[PDB]
Amino acid sequence: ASPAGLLTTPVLTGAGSDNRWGAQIVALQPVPSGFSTCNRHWNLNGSTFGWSSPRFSDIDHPRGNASYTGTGSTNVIETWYANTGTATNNPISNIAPDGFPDMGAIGPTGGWVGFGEVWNVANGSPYNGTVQAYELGFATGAPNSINPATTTVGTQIVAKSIYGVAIGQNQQTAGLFVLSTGIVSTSGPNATTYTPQPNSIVVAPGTPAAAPIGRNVPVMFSGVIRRAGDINAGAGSVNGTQYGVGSQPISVTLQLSLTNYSSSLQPGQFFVWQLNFASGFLEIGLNVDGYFYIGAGASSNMIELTELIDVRPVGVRPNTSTLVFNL
Amino acid sequence: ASPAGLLTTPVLTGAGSDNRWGAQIVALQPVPSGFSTCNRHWNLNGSTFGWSSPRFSDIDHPRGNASYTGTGSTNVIETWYANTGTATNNPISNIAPDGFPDMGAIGFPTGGWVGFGEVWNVANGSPYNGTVQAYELGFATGAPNSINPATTTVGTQIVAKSIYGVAIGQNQQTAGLFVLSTGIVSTSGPNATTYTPQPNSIVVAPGTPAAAPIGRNVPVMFSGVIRRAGDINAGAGSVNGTQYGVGSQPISVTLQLSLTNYSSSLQPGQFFVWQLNFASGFLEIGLNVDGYFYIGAGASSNMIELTELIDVRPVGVRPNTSTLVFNL
Amino acid sequence: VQLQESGGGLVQAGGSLRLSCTASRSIFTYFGKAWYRQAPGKERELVASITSGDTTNYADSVKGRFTISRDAAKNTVYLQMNSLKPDDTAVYYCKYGSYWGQGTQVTVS
Amino acid sequence: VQLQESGGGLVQAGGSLRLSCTASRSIFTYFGKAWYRQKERELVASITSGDTTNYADSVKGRFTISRDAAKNTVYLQMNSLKPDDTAVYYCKYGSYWGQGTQVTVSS
Numbered sequence: 001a002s003p004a005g006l007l008t009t010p011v012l013t014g015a016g017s018d019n020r021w022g023a024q025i026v027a028l029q030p031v032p033s034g035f036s037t038c039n040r041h042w043n044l045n046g047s048t049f050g051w052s053s054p055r056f057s058d059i060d061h062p063r064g065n066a067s068y069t070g071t072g073s074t075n076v077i078e079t080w081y082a083n084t085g086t087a088t089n090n091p092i093s094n095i096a097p098d099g100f101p102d103m104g105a106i107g108p109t110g111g112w113v114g115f116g117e118v119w120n121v122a123n124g125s126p127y128n129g130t131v132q133a134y135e136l137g138f139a140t141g142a143p144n145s146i147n148p149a150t151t152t153v154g155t156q157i158v159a160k161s162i163y164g165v166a167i168g169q170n171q172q173t174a175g176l177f178v179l180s181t182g183i184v185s186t187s188g189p190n191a192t193t194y195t196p197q198p199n200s201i202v203v204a205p206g207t208p209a210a211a212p213i214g215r216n217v218p219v220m221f222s223g224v225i226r227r228a229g230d231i232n233a234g235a236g237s238v239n240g241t242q243y244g245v246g247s248q249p250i251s252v253t254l255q256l257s258l259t260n261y262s263s264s265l266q267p268g269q270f271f272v273w274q275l276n277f278a279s280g281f282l283e284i285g286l287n288v289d290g291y292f293y294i295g296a297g298a299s300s301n302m303i304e305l306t307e308l309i310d311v312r313p314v315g316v317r318p319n320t321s322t323l324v325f326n327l
Numbered sequence: 328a329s330p331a332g333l334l335t336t337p338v339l340t341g342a343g344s345d346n347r348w349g350a351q352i353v354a355l356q357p358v359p360s361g362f363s364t365c366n367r368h369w370n371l372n373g374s375t376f377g378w379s380s381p382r383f384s385d386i387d388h389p390r391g392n393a394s395y396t397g398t399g400s401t402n403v404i405e406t407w408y409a410n411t412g413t414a415t416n417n418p419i420s421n422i423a424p425d426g427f428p429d430m431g432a433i434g435f436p437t438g439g440w441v442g443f444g445e446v447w448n449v450a451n452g453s454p455y456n457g458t459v460q461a462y463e464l465g466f467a468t469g470a471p472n473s474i475n476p477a478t479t480t481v482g483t484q485i486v487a488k489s490i491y492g493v494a495i496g497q498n499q500q501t502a503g504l505f506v507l508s509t510g511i512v513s514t515s516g517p518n519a520t521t522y523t524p525q526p527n528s529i530v531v532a533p534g535t536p537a538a539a540p541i542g543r544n545v546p547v548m549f550s551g552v553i554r555r556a557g558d559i560n561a562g563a564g565s566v567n568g569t570q571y572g573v574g575s576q577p578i579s580v581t582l583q584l585s586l587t588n589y590s591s592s593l594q595p596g597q598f599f600v601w602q603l604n605f606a607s608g609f610l611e612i613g614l615n616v617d618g619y620f621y622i623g624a625g626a627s628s629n630m631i632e633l634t635e636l637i638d639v640r641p642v643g644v645r646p647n648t649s650t651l652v653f654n655l
Numbered sequence: 656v657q658l659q660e661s662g663g664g665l666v667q668a669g670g671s672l673r674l675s676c677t678a679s680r681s682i683f684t685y686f687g688k689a690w691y692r693q694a695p696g697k698e699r700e701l702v703a704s705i706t707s708g709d710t711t712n713y714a715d716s717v718k719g720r721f722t723i724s725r726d727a728a729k730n731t732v733y734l735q736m737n738s739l740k741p742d743d744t745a746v747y748y749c750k751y752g753s754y755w756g757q758g759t760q761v762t763v764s
Numbered sequence: 765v766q767l768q769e770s771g772g773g774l775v776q777a778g779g780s781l782r783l784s785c786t787a788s789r790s791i792f793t794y795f796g797k798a799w800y801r802q803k804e805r806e807l808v809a810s811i812t813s814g815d816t817t818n819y820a821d822s823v824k825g826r827f828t829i830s831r832d833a834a835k836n837t838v839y840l841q842m843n844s845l846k847p848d849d850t851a852v853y854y855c856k857y858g859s860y861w862g863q864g865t866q867v868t869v870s871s
Contacts, residue, residue, distance in 0.1 A: 008586050008587055013685060013707045013710075014708060015685045045860060046795050047765070047791040047859075047860075053341075054342060055578070056383065058509055062564065074456075115443060116561070118563075129460045129461040129489070129491030130460045180507075181507045232447045233457075233505060234445075235387065236505070250382075254582065255583070310704075310706075336796070340794065341814070373686045373752050373753045374752055533681070606818075636814065
């Protein structure tokens, strides 16, 4: 099938969502440095190097280690951790549970927060209807010295509670369950451009990279996500908002996983659309790895989709030809 | 564009998800009585009658009333409720927040939608300690304290009712609602439930076209496995049990119909038909202009497992009065 | 779903008309809304478009004189035509997402 | 991503070969994995995500297709071979095609 239908005006005028946060796509984010992504990322050969299905699954890991630090007066922080490779009930890959975010654990960087539980059948804490906030990511040095990791070889996945409790959790091993929604922790909600930065994205061995090619630089899809804060969980977004990025519109990921596109593009080729604005247009391209490219050069300024008029396909073209950028 | 690409073999062998619960599609659910659905349901004209976008948004409502009932100190039950039509910050529809589920509230034996969230007022007297709690969400009349399920949106209410006692600080009588998108199902008692929501529990807006049977051709929903809400834990290990949830469309179909014009390719009274091939036997599935899928099951209400499915093949456009082969 | 077009008819040059186009149900669509027109001996042409982000766009011949807008609550899109010229005489068609109307005749004398 | 097949050669009728096919990276795809031979290429055998096997009528009862997802590998057990089976056998790993391995069966 032809790639032309994979981008349409609705994708970029309200109905698109990025494949990492599931946030409504309002902007394009040039990445001059280049980047890689595999989790919930599909290519035009219908395959992924990641550990996630093209949906936003809840997170479930049957066995990690839990440890606890804290005086006792609502101070006990819970850290759960497992080696990569132990998510053996995930048919896609045992790297990490389906839905685990491809971001480094926090050690002005944004981190992934979700609401969940650490559970062992013999734990003494009774259930009264709550789940709590955990920072989630790939790391080394858990439990005592968590540090962000960006590969899946020999590293850990961690969930660390943000708020302290007293006693009640004591079992050394336990399962992790986290609801799919991610919000973003950042201690510098003014200095955080967008999350994750290229250097925070976790990728698996084999994952093709998206490097610049001439003035063509890879681009991410950006949308507004809730910031985690201490006023409430998320009512009214009163803790603030940030920009989250993903490598693909989820509608693109999904279609690439459902439908064969493996004959419609060669290495070295982009499928190109034109984006028309008032007072200008630019071109966006898609390669066989499933990355999108823009012709923005060293510019990292976010391109707002507020004034987009329409998307129109252009056709196949080599990735060396410059994607026009007349805004 | 052609409707043919809307069903492929991966949609039904592990990559599909229903448009209501987001659960991996593992079975077809015939509905010989018919049903309606509008929320997160799109037609081939690119439009929806519902209040939700073709994603699973988190739920945010700026203003409802909060009511509290409790005989002791640790069983104070919180009931948030708003009239439909007050979700003013939802560009799609003010009927209800984007993502609010299209299911009747549990009144005083059917499955209910459970999500985790909070009821918040800036003027309130509670401190945040990183938790959200389970609520029953649904449409109703009679809130608070005489809740009856509702299945229509004019002059009715949306409700979030806490399952467990909440904590002190609940002063204000108005408050906002925030619920994470994930839904699990509450069911109880020794009675069995086949799937949730049953047709008589689905909430629709006025004008929503129904899916009525046509001869032996009856509408079908897409079934996946969803966690049961229970008192062992929130969801780890699915130890509270599981059941089947249903939706009117695979979310990939909903999304594509919202993104791409299919309006020329189907007239009223027509199906696009695919062939579903199994080891022994095959059946045809049809899609009509309203976005509903059909199967030729006649009176058979029993689930069709997709575990032995070999492939999906497009067949083409057919009158909807032509019997869809049902040979399993 | 049906569309109801209204507000056409006869106007003299430099006069004004407001076209209205109302869908018969409270539907939502991400597809854009638009007005087309067809003059005698000419091809149908795009006059004005608006996206779900309310971004408007206009044919050269009408840019500055015509304005498209919408009332979501009323399921309605409008075409405000000012300083009408005889060149503007045509059948005007509303496109409400993927829906089309029968068209309303505009005559500028 | 590249494929690597093995197990092709020349054998008398009634004999047996085993075909192997190994993808060069640990990828996941929802597309089924299958073997094809070649007149015009026919489907020899296929298996989907749900591990359900579909066989051509001419090879039914004799051939058995199996998968080891941990090794990124699909197998074709060719038994009771016949001169009708001679062809170039291609592995299909989702959408990835392999350079066929030649199989000949003399009477």
